[PDB]
Amino acid sequence: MYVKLISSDGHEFIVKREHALTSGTIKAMLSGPGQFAENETNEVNFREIPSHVLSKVCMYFTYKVRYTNSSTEIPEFPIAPEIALELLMAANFLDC
Amino acid sequence: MEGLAGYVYKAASEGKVLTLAALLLNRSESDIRYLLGYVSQQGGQRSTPLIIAARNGHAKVVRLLLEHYRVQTQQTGTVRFDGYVIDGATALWCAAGAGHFEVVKLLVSHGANVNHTTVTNSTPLRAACFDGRLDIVKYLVENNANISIANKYDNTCLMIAAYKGHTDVVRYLLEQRADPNAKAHCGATALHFAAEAGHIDIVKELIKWRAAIVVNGHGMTPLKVAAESCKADVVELLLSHADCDRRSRIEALELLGASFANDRENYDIIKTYHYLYLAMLERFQDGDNILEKEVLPPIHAYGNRTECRNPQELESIRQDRDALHMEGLIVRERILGADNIDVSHPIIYRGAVYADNMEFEQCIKLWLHALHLRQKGNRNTHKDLLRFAQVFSQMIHLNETVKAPDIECVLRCSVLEIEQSMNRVKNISDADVHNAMDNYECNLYTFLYLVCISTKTQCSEEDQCKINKQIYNLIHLDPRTREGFTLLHLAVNSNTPVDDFHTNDVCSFPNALVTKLLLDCGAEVNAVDNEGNSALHIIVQYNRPISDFLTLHSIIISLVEAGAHTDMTNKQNKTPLDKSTTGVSEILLKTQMKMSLKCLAARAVRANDINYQDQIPRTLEEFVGFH
């Protein structure tokens, strides 16, 4: 029911399964023989993602699940200038 | 100086001597000669101060200029303002072209330029031939000027004299024993130009000189030229040169009867039959070596007529109007073939008549056949496509249905015409680039009008698929205007021109139906102009959000669903949200703006101006360029 995203350094970022599954590559990584449907772990082991980058990625997962179409305006995402240029590449790697 | 150039420009324009003396003296040698040796840009077209002296025939100001100075007539100027406005002409060129003999004689004694050759090698005699003044022409030859100067298409001075109504010029040229068989680029030698404007005196003037008969490049004899021009006065004159034979005598009468059948100025239905019946009886006059009428294959466009092989059947259709008009078109095709310049002009005239007479299906068939004939000749049928769109919109306004195969054929022909327009734009370096681009944009706009008509009309499902296939092919041809506006942009921006005719009653731009069709066919929804604007990046700039909110809501839904980036910045880095320029249109975008971490991160990168060059995947380097 809950996916088990982990960064390169080992910082686990467990979140709701559909919250991650909003992205596409995290859906592809879950599907296939890498499923291991124990129904609790469903872990995905990234290799080239720093911890803060995937932290903000999980932030965005929750943020996009919450305000998917509610009202018109949404609060701005708090992307630090230093964490950019690594969040964008992790967006491509996740096809978010 | 530039200001002093305009000061002496008015002095020569008013024809004043004492005013120019104070404005061309009491100075050094360098600045004084500049005023008399430079053109003045007035009214958007440059002209010498001596040109405006020769143009108005102000001989008083310009005669004393040559006495007290050494000003020459070799100053480069324009030719005329009657739709030419091209430069390169000398100052003597406009001296003969202004119809003033008093200014020609003064320029000869001070540096005569009678043998001037411009980019079009147009001597002052050519302008004198265009002016048609006998005194100017006679004196200009007296100053040792060549008369056989031919342009790129061999514009002999006898041709322009034969083309124009100045019959005094052409009769003086033969007294100098000029060439009668002046071969042109298209093969038009003397009699082709003379016997086309109904100049009975000019054609008679060359009978003695024996201009003979030679087939030009369009496969037409000079006798057949008079028959095509609906000028019966010179048709009978050209039949009496004692070398016509039986084959070329009746066919000239048939051509004259066919040309008289459908024309704007000369539309005579009694003379059309009588000339044809005279030609019909001349063929069937002996019974031995009888000139039997060869029969063209039947054409569905002209109903199902199979010509008139007998005088009896021609008589039976004398009282019926459209049969005589339809019969004259077939015989005109038999004589002139499918390669004449004006073979389809009677067909277009008949189509316009039928459209004015509310006959639609026959008009569409005739205009389709005329379009096919003109397309076989590789000509800009943009006017024909505009006519098609106009009659389709006229049918729509009167709620008359338009058949789907008709608009399918018109759209396919327009797609091919756009292909050849791109070809003409590509190969031409600087010859007629502006004209080719204008024709290209007109073709694209006519295609859009026909597309809008097709969307409004009901069409067959398979033929709707054919329409989608034609539009798909055109999109894969990727049309592009001067601003880089793609086909999708012109179906979005309200600044897209619409013709003044009935097309203005059917074509509302932006159009909700057209954008749905273009995206369904597969238009690149992220296509950028020279400024980088997308299709959605322009629809927000609509200045009527609430007048046609149904229109603006449908297109933004269609553009977003196709996958247009809502963040694609222009060259000035303005998002469609930022270029909303409208309260309402901003609201609709905010609803359809699908979220993306990639978009937000790219906005953060671009706003912070981080050095992203060669630190990201190469396919992402373009993506930061968008956001």
Add this chain to the structure above:
Amino acid sequence: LMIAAYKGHTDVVRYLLEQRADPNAKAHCGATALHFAAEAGHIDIVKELIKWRAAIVVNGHGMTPLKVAAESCKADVVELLLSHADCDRRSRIEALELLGASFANDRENYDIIKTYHYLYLAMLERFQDGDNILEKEVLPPIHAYGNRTECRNPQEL
């Protein structure tokens, strides 16, 4: 001014406008000729009155010229009277709601898709800011129209 603006004659209205006519030509009916222009949709006359800043007053029945334009199912007059910038968020919201409602019931121009689109545009602008939203003020339900209490939610609409 009002006589020539109720009928489609922009030339007389303009000529009086540069003849220093009444910018607020009040009447017993409480009009301005902006109301009269809105009643017949002479959009050029509306432009002429806007270019001289003919102002906006409340009619005898409680109507601004923008409201009269919205009631008469004339969208272009709503556009021109909304672009005059002397109208706040509440006025914009109520004008759009009135126009969308007026397209729902009128024999001359009954387009239900226009009704839904204009009502949804009005609702979106009501919930534009997320916070400080101009929430509806729906009266208790009327038995004639079933018992539905308007639509105070985007999903409700």
Add this chain to the structure above:
Amino acid sequence: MDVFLMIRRHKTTIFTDAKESSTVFELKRIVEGILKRPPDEQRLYKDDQLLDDGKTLGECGFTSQTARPQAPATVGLAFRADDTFEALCIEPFSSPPELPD
């Protein structure tokens, strides 16, 4: 109304949803429902301050604006080893690299 929030222990950092009126004990219930460990072994720490089990999130300080949804507040987590409770250890995230140029 509700917020989302982060529960951090050592390197693990789990995200969850919780009401303002939801108590710390309910957060322990959901942590048990995901992390599969009994809540009596678990202590939830706002920064370093121990939280009462019956205290709601609004009483603790997790309002709809203080714990902003896109940047939620960090709730510490301490487990129990046998009969002894472990100390609150939270490893920080990886340091972002220096801004180029």
